[PDB]
C-alpha cells in the first residue's frame, strides 16, 4: 500500500473504478492549448468515481484557466483555492501581453472532507524550475500535511512523480506496479490478461 504505485496506461480508456476512492486527486493534464487531449476528452474523464469527500488539485495555464474551471465544476467540485507557483532559478530570482512568472493550480472540493488540516500552508509556492512540464515537488508535502497518510492518486504523472501513498497514472510510466491488495485484486478481475483497451 504505502510505497509508490503506478499504472502505465491511456487515461482515456482505463477503468478507474478498480482503483477505489482517494482523499486527494491531482492532475497536470495535457490541455489542447495553442500528445494532448481534446476539450471533450477532458470533460469525459471519469474523475467523479475517484472520490466521495476530498480535494482535487488541477494545474492550468492559458485558456485551461477557464476550461479547467469548467471540468472541475462538471466533475462535481467547487473551486475553493488557487495555488500559484512562482518560478525561480537556483538564485531565487523569477524566471503574449506579459511575461509569465507563475503557473496556477486550481483547488476543488467535493463532498464533506473531514479531518483535513486546512490552513497549514499558504497558497504561494516559490521553487526552482526543473525540466519542462515538471511541477515542483513541494506540492506533495503541502498535500501530505493537508491530509497525512491517506490514499492519493495522480493523473498524467511521469516516473519522477511517483511518491509514497500515491498511485500515479500516465502513458510514460514503465509498466504496472501495484501493491495495495484491494487494488491488485480488482485489477486482475477487470484486466485478467493485463491489457487495457477501448
Amino acid at each position: 500500500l504505502f510505497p509508490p504505485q503506478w499504472i502505465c496506461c491511456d487515461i482515456r480508456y482505463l477503468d478507474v473504478s478498480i482503483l477505489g476512492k482517494f482523499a486527494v486527486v491531482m492532475a497536470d493534464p495535457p490541455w489542447d492549448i495553442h500528445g494532448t487531449l481534446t476539450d471533450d476528452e477532458m470533460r469525459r474523464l471519469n474523475i467523479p468515481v475517484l472520490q466521495d469527500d476530498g480535494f482535487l488539485f488541477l494545474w492550468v495555464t492559458g485558456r485551461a484557466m477557464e476550461l479547467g474551471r469548467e471540468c472541475l465544476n462538471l466533475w462535481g467540485y467547487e473551486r475553493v483555492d488557487e495555488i500559484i507557483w512562482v518560478k525561480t532559478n537556483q538564485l531565487q530570482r523569477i524566471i503574449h501581453w506579459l511575461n509569465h512568472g507563475k503557473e496556477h493550480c486550481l483547488v476543488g472540493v467535493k463532498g464533506n472532507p473531514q479531518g483535513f488540516n486546512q490552513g497549514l500552508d499558504c497558497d504561494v509556492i516559490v521553487a526552482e524550475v526543473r525540466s519542462t512540464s515538471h511541477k515542483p515537488d513541494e506540492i506533495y508535502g503541502m498535500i501530505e500535511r493537508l491530509s497525512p497518510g491517506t490514499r492519493k492518486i495522480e493523473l498524467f504523472g511521469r516516473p519522477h512523480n511517483v511518491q509514497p501513498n500515491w498511485i500515479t497514472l500516465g502513458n510514460q510510466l514503465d509498466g504496472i506496479h501495484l501493491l495495495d491488495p484491494d487494488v491488485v485484486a480488482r485489477f486482475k478481475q477487470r484486466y485478467p490478461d493485463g491489457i487495457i483497451s477501448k
Binding site: 473551486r79 523569477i94 509569465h100 504561494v124 513541494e138
Partner: protein, 240 residues
C-alpha cells in the same frame, strides 16, 4: 530548500525569499497623459452611460467584503453595465480578490464581452510580521488577482509587495505602471478609485471622492482630432 516547509515551521511566507532603459517610455507616457480628472459618484445609483467618451481601458476595483477584516457583492458588480462604456476595442483590469471572485470575475468579464488574456497576481510578503480564514479555504490566502480582459481586435504578471496594514485596502500602484506600459490608448477610467488614487492620465470615479472636476465636454476635447488614436506612448501632436 522547501520554502513551504519553512513557512509552516516559521511563519515566513515563501514569497519573502524572492530576490530582486525604460525612462524614455515612462516620460513619453507622462508627456501624453491628460490632466487628472475625477468625479464623485455613487456608482450603484449612477447611470454610467453619462461617462463619455467610450474608454480604451477600464480599471475596476469594487470594494469587496473580504477586503475588510458600502461593500459590493459579485451580484452588484455583475449587474454593472460595463459594456455600455467600453470602446469596441478596449481592455479591462478587474481586481477579483482571492475567493469566489476568481470565478465570478471571469463570469463578469465574459458577460461584458471580454476574454481574459492575463491573470496578474499581487503576492503579499510578511517580512515585517512573520507568522500572522474563509471557511472554504484550504490554504492561507496570501495573494490577490487582477484579471486582464480584452475585447475587439516588458512587464511580468506578478506584483510583490509587503502585505499592507489592517484596514488598508489600497492596491499596489504598480498595477498602473503595468497598464500604462501596454500603450492601449489614452481614455482610461478607474471605477471605485479614491482621492488617494487620482493620477494624471486617468479619469477616476468613485463614491468617496471629496471633489470633482469632471466635465464630459472638456474630457472629450482631450481626444478630439488630431489626437483620437494616440496610444499614450508617442510624442504629442504638434500644433500651430
Amino acid at each position: 530548500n522547501d520554502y513551504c516547509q519553512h513557512f509552516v515551521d516559521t511563519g515566513h511566507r515563501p514569497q519573502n525569499f524572492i530576490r530582486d532603459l525604460i525612462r524614455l517610455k515612462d516620460e513619453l507616457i507622462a508627456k501624453s497623459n491628460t490632466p487628472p480628472m475625477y468625479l464623485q459618484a455613487d456608482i450603484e445609483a449612477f447611470d454610467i452611460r453619462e461617462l463619455t467618451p467610450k474608454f480604451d481601458v477600464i480599471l475596476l476595483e469594487p470594494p469587496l467584503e473580504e477586503y475588510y477584516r458600502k461593500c459590493w457583492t459579485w451580484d452588484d458588480i455583475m449587474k454593472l453595465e460595463i459594456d455600455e462604456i467600453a470602446a469596441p476595442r478596449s481592455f479591462i483590469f478587474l481586481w477579483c480578490g482571492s475567493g469566489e471572485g476568481l470565478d465570478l470575475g471571469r463570469v463578469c468579464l465574459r458577460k461584458w464581452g471580454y476574454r481574459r488574456c492575463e491573470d496578474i497576481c499581487w503576492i503579499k510578503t510578511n517580512k515585517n510580521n512573520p507568522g500572522k480564514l474563509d471557511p472554504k479555504a484550504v490554504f492561507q490566502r496570501t495573494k490577490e488577482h487582477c484579471l486582464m480582459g480584452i475585447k475587439g481586435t516588458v512587464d511580468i504578471d506578478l506584483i510583490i509587495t509587503e502585505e499592507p496594514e489592517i484596514g488598508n485596502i489600497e492596491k499596489p500602484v504598480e498595477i498602473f505602471h503595468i497598464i500604462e506600459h501596454f500603450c492601449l490608448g489614452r481614455r482610461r477610467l478607474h471605477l471605485f478609485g479614491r482621492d488617494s488614487t487620482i493620477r494624471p492620465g486617468w479619469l477616476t470615479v468613485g463614491p468617496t471622492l471629496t471633489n470633482s472636476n469632471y466635465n464630459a465636454e472638456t474630457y472629450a476635447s482631450y481626444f478630439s482630432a488630431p489626437n483620437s488614436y494616440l496610444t499614450g506612448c508617442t510624442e504629442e501632436i504638434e500644433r500651430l
